[PDB]
Amino acid sequence: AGYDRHITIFSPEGRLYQVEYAFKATNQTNINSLAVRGKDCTVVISQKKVPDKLLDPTTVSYIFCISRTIGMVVNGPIPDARNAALRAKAEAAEFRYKYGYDMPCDVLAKRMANLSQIYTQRAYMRPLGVILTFVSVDEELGPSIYKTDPAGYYVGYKATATGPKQQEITTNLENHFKKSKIDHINEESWEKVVEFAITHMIDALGTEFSKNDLEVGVATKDKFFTLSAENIEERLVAIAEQD
Amino acid sequence: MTDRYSFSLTTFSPSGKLGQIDYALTAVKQGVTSLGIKATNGVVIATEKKSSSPLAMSETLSKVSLLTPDIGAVYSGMGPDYRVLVDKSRKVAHTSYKRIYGEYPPTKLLVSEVAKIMQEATQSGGVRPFGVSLLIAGHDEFNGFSLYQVDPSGSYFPWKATAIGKGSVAAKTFLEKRWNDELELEDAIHIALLTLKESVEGEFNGDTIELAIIGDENPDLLGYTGIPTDKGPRFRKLTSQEINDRLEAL
Amino acid sequence: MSLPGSKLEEARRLVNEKQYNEAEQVYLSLLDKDSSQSSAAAGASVDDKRRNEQETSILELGQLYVTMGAKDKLREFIPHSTEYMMQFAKSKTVKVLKTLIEKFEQVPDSLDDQIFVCEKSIEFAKREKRVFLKHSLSIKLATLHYQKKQYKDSLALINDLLREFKKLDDKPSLVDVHLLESKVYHKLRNLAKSKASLTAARTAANSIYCPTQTVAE
Amino acid sequence: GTGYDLSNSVFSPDGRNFQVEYAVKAVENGTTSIGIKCNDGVVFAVEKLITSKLLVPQKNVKIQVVDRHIGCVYSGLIPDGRHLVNRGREEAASFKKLYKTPIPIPAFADRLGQYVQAHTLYNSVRPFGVSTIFGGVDKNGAHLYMLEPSGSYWGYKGAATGKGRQSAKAELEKLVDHHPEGLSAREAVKQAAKIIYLAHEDNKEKDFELEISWCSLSETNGLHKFVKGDLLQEAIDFAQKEI
Amino acid sequence: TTIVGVKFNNGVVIAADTRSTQGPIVADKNCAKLHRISPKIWCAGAGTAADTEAVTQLIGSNIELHSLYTSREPRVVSALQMLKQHLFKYQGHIGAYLIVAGVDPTGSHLFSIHAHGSTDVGYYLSLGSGSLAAMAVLESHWKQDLTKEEAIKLASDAIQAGIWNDLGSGSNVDVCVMEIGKDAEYLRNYLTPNVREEKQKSYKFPRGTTAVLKESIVNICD
Amino acid sequence: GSRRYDSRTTIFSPEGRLYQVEYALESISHAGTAIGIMASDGIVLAAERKVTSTLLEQDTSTEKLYKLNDKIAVAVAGLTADAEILINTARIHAQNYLKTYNEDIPVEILVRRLSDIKQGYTQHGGLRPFGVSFIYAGYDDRYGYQLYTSNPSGNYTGWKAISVGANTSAAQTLLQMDYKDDMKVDDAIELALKTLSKTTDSSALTYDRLEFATIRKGANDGEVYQKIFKPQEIKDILVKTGIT
Amino acid sequence: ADVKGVCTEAGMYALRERRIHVTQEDFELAVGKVMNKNQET
Amino acid sequence: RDRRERRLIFGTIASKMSLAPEADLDSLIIRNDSLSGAVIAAIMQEAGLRAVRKNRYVILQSDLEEAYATQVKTDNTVDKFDFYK
């Protein structure tokens, strides 16, 4: 009966074997990214890695836009990443027409998590090999970040990260919050928040990136946009001048 | 086409039991331990919040949900399928009662509907049984305050007080001598704190412990005035500051 | 203004600057003032989250009642705070019934005034179903009888708690019961009961962990 | 355990899929195909290996054109390659029905992307073991995409896969340094025929065939058609001159 | 049935009568016509009372579920959108008149939906058979910057006008006041313009007036 | 493919039996023991709960017994999860006969309609059969007092005294020699108390671990009265019979 | 087996004071020590 | 162990070590989960080793928290079971 490990069923150890391998699929691409909560907004950064020169830098992105008020960043292989991307855009449209006004961040992370829980419980569907991370600015609780696990468990984070080096990156964001005893960056301007997360990423990875080596998403209140090559390079200019 | 698996994943073992529900109970002890205590003035249930990351927010994580305004629920472990069961429980509770009888179902009838969803996963094919164990506690106009234990195998049993989880062995035994016939709501809270404190090996505070109590009908939690019939919901969620007030009370 | 930090910190300096009566009138003026959220306390003003600051006003003046001679008047001061807490939530009831007594026994006071306050606080638990609050005050009441050096009132509460805590709850609190019982027979020059009580206290000490103050005693 | 490589939805212990990896080997067993992206449009080229003399010259068209604005060339199993275009043909017909104006290039890539993703999520179906290269002239600029068996795709300045994937696609890197500013559509036709002969070293054991098709706004103006007349024979002599 | 509403700066207030209309014969002179979709959102029925006491319970149930799933406060814009597409699914064959009143963290909202799915918006809205007589009184006394006490007297005079000038309204008046800062205030029998006096003669009959054919006792408790 | 993960629930064994049905019969021995008794003036049902303690709620609960009709009771021995599925469909099929024919349903028709459900999963559906067994007892004016039982296989036979659950053959031995046709309702209670005491795993026998629901006939003939014994009335008969 | 362990721990507490007389003081500490090993894990 | 049996090891090793008067050892004792004696020994050693490259002599409080995360993780990246199901 060696087929017990090939699907999702109760194991003799009381665990799930296929769920344990779902988290391991996100480390195949080896893409490190993090997200922090600003004062009035939220800024997310990601490492842009282009293996071949034949790839168009504008087409390759790990940050997808679900709606005008909500951004998204996903780690792991792109096919499972864009599979849940179009599923999240459909849930945001059904919520506007049927239910009411635009969807907030927590509802999108909860509906996509419950959708993966049905796929995990049912044995004829394999779980997604990626991790859904949604960033937006709510009109009630303000800036919030919800990271949806492939197992279907969503929980809020102050400053999150992703990748195999996440445990080394989390230490950087954790030690900063212990000394200041603050749960968010007190900088009001969103420009200083962009250069804030980039500074901690360079010192943690020990690598100075370029305009094409990073993709910085910016989620403001009721607006979301992705910084271009000139906007990302402009942030790296003031970083070398100050520090 | 769609799915080609129509058979049930749960089969009868040669030992005379079901292999899926046997390992389902084992997975309940693989995670955080919850508990609850029933008294004469109300039912007090408690749990612990285990943060996977030190930067996680415990306010966004709610381990005690609300099915009906008079009945709460609490699970053990991470509860992967807990969100699926609650979403399906709130629909069948309002459709079969609120949309038919016009009122919310009592505690004994609600736990029968919650177990009705879990008992189908052990038989109907294409799905696997639920590896979570809930606790149905509430108040009605006949049975009064009652607490039911929901097993992952699909069966429910009434219990005065119980604790299920990783520390279910020691915590359940300690509640035998700490419970009697005459108890109050606030007096039962100290019973839950003394038992849960011994099971917490990590940080002990009010943010990592979610204490849900069912008291009388509160007009402040209702939201409207002028109707003497409805005095508000009995179930109440204590804030972070109110829980820490009773932690140092020991 | 309504800032509590301006009223409380100013009264702390007025004690050494001029007299403690000027600071007492400021704390007594907070009964009808200094509103808060949730429900009220004495009905004149609303005190909920700042109730701990209101209790601090009594704790600060509690050490100053020794010179003024309020020891005899301290008998009815503590139980009056119980009726003020019935309006708002009872989460602050246990703190007031304890933190005050913790600072009440620290300052020097007559033994008759200390016993009558604890017996009055138990009366609030007699009309109710309170269990832990009745047992927490009973073990602290028998401790006050030990300073009086009388075996009649000391062994009366110990024998009642010994026949209960054995098969009932409060197993870690039972260590202090045997510890206080071993002290009673020590003044009576009895080495049979005193050494036997220390054995029952040290038995549960290795099972359930005890704090530094308990292990040191 | 044993049998992780048997069915589809079963993950490997390292978080990958064997059936997806086995479908990649089926791509390199078919006829190679290349592509060239320019500013005005894209150029498609494919080398069809002739088995025996029984084949009728230039009566076989491997490239299946979607509407007038999208050509599609595939390298892999022939039956699996025709099902992708037939599925995309219905998506283009369903789009133009509701959405009026034809579907652009970056939009058409999402229809084939999600459709392949559904085959990897079921145990009753198998993933496509063919790699389809599609592109054309969209409403703004131009784009080129290569659909992999895993469903992973991005923007490509050039795309080549097949037996000569290690050769033909390696020559695309020299094309970028040759014309970094830009490349005309007419010159890209002659450059596409040379790349076929540069990777022909492994195809010299059999007979080949040259089929080139391009679309741009300079001449055809949004019309994807094969090269015929003296233009095809002119690119042969220019490509064979360096051989 | 006559229902109105008044939207002031700090919130919105609506009113309704206690007299249900079955046609020329009035069966019930006292009833509650203000339905509760959610604790913080109230709705007023008009026209057919059968379709209002059903759809509001069906749509109100899904909205209470949506408030529990999102763990937030239900909003008027979310309640109208669920009700707007519901009546459109039936192609307007279900006659209904409803005015959705309430507030939310983003402001105050007042809306009125028709039977076939059309929705309206405004500071004052009135539906039902007595909507015409109550509309003229509102437009005369309505102005900018209305307070809480002035909005109650304005909404009370609208229903009271429909009592005298319409046969389809009367008996008492029920006013539900909603405030952003405080909670909802539901005042039943706020105004009693119609109070019946005492009859001239006592019609109570003595025992034994009506003959009894056969008397029996039916067992109830098993 | 789905053929490899399929365990072939219903297949004919070389011995001529079913694998899942043979293993489902063992699950009854791992559950509580339900023993029915059919007397002359009524029917006495006995049951014993499994995994009980002081923290159990003895106020209102029935694990092993339910009421499907005013004149018909039921004894549940087996898995509780699979029991509620057949119990909910039992009251539906029982009321459908009462909704159409406007008369009380007998036991023979109620059991055969429920047995076909268990017989369905053993044939088609590719699912597992119900691992719970039932004992149906009711009153009828046709055959008189009727006592029947079911099995995971879906078969039902007439029984004067039936015993299911743990120690099936151990309880039926004492029930065969001590059974009489003139045994009344009071004498039928003593037969179940002495049987459940010797067949258990404990030393003494309390009233918290037992459940008794009988069928009594009042002074008016033609209609019986379903009475479930409360824990206050269960401890009373233990003293009068000398069981204690 | 647990009662047999009391015989071993009956005099272990007397070895600290080095006395030949074994009173009920040592038996009380022996019972509490054995019960802790049984309840552990 | 618990916060009792562990704090006797930290205070004993710190006698031969050199730390700062503002360093608080009780901060890490609360966060100790499933540790042993050898793990505690590596914490005090690594805290003194990193002080050389940081141009320090006595062990500060910040170096105790940085060197604690290295030996607390019991398998590879997963601790024991991490958190998930």
UniProtKB/Swiss-Prot annotation, chain B:
Location of this chain's protein in the cell: Cytoplasm; Nucleus
Keywords of this entry: Cytoplasm, Isopeptide bond, Nucleus, Proteasome, Ubl conjugation
UniProt KW Cytoplasm keyword: yes
Database matches in InterPro entries: Ntn_hydrolases_N, Proteasome_alpha, Proteasome_alpha-type, Proteasome_asu_N, Proteasome_sua/b
Recorded superkingdom: Eukaryota
Biological process, per Gene Ontology: proteasomal ubiquitin-independent protein catabolic process; proteasome-mediated ubiquitin-dependent protein catabolic process
Ranges annotated as spanning the membrane: none
Glycyl lysine isopeptide (Lys-Gly) (interchain with G-Cter in ubiquitin) cross-link, renumbered residues: 108
Pfam family, one: Proteasome_A_N
CDD domains: proteasome_alpha_type_2
Family: Belongs to the peptidase T1A family.
Other facts: Present with 7060 molecules/cell in log phase SD medium.
Record's subunit section: The 26S proteasome consists of a 20S proteasome core and two 19S regulatory subunits. The 20S proteasome core is composed of 28 subunits that are arranged in four stacked rings, resulting in a barrel-shaped structure. The two end rings are each formed by seven alpha subunits, and the two central rings are each formed by seven beta subunits. The catalytic chamber with the active sites is on the inside of the barrel.
Protein name per its UniProtKB record: Proteasome subunit alpha type-2
Organism annotation: Saccharomyces cerevisiae (strain ATCC 204508 / S288c) (Baker's yeast)
UniProtKB/Swiss-Prot annotation, chain C:
Gene Ontology CC entries for this record: proteasome complex; proteasome regulatory particle, lid subcomplex; proteasome storage granule
Record PTM text: N-acetylated by NAT1.
Annotated signal sequence range: none
Superkingdom of source: Eukaryota
Modified residues (N-acetylserine): 2
Gene Ontology molecular functions: structural molecule activity
Entry keyword annotation includes Acetylation: yes
Outcome of substituting residue 132 to L: In rpn6-2; temperature-sensitive mutant that shows defects in proteasome assembly when incubated at 37 degrees Celsius
Keyword annotations: Acetylation, Proteasome
Record-level GO BP terms: proteasome assembly; proteasome-mediated ubiquitin-dependent protein catabolic process; ubiquitin-dependent protein catabolic process
Keyword Transmembrane part of the UniProt annotation: no
Subunit structure: Component of the lid subcomplex of the 19S proteasome regulatory particle complex (also named PA700 complex). The 26S proteasome consists of a 20S proteasome core and two 19S regulatory subunits.
Note: Present with 16800 molecules/cell in log phase SD medium.
Family from the record: Belongs to the proteasome subunit S9 family.
Role played: Component of the lid subcomplex of the 26S proteasome, a multiprotein complex involved in the ATP-dependent degradation of ubiquitinated proteins. In the complex, RPN6 is required for proteasome assembly.
UniProt-recorded name of the protein: 26S proteasome regulatory subunit RPN6
Organism listed in the record: Saccharomyces cerevisiae (strain ATCC 204508 / S288c) (Baker's yeast)
Curated annotation (Swiss-Prot), chain D:
Keyword presence, Nucleus: yes
GO BP terms in the entry: proteasomal ubiquitin-independent protein catabolic process; proteasome-mediated ubiquitin-dependent protein catabolic process
Alphabetical UniProt keywords: Acetylation, Cytoplasm, Nucleus, Proteasome
A GO cellular component entry from the record: proteasome storage granule
Membrane-traversing stretches: none
PTM note: The alpha and beta forms are probably products of the same gene with different post-translational modifications.
Keyword Cytoplasm: yes
Residues of the full protein shown: 5 to 247 of 288
Family note: Belongs to the peptidase T1A family.
Note: Present with 12000 molecules/cell in log phase SD medium.
Task performed by this protein: The proteasome degrades poly-ubiquitinated proteins in the cytoplasm and in the nucleus. It is essential for the regulated turnover of proteins and for the removal of misfolded proteins. The proteasome is a multicatalytic proteinase complex that is characterized by its ability to cleave peptides with Arg, Phe, Tyr, Leu, and Glu adjacent to the leaving group at neutral or slightly basic pH. It has an ATP-dependent proteolytic activity.
Localization of this protein: Cytoplasm; Nucleus
Name under which the protein is recorded: Probable proteasome subunit alpha type-7
GO MF: mRNA binding
Curated annotation (Swiss-Prot), chain G:
Annotated compartments: Cytoplasm; Nucleus
Source organism, top-level taxon: Eukaryota
Modifications made to the protein after synthesis: N-acetylated by NAT1.
Signal sequence extent: none
Annotated family: Belongs to the AAA ATPase family.
Extra remark: Present with 4700 molecules/cell in log phase SD medium.
Subunit structure: May form a homodimer or a heterodimer with a related family member. Interacts with OLA1, TMA17, and UBR1.
Protein purpose: The 26S proteasome is involved in the ATP-dependent degradation of ubiquitinated proteins. The regulatory (or ATPase) complex confers ATP dependency and substrate specificity to the 26S complex.
The protein's name in its UniProt record: 26S proteasome regulatory subunit 8 homolog
Source species of the chain: Saccharomyces cerevisiae (strain ATCC 204508 / S288c)
Positions spanned in the full protein: 356 to 396 of 405
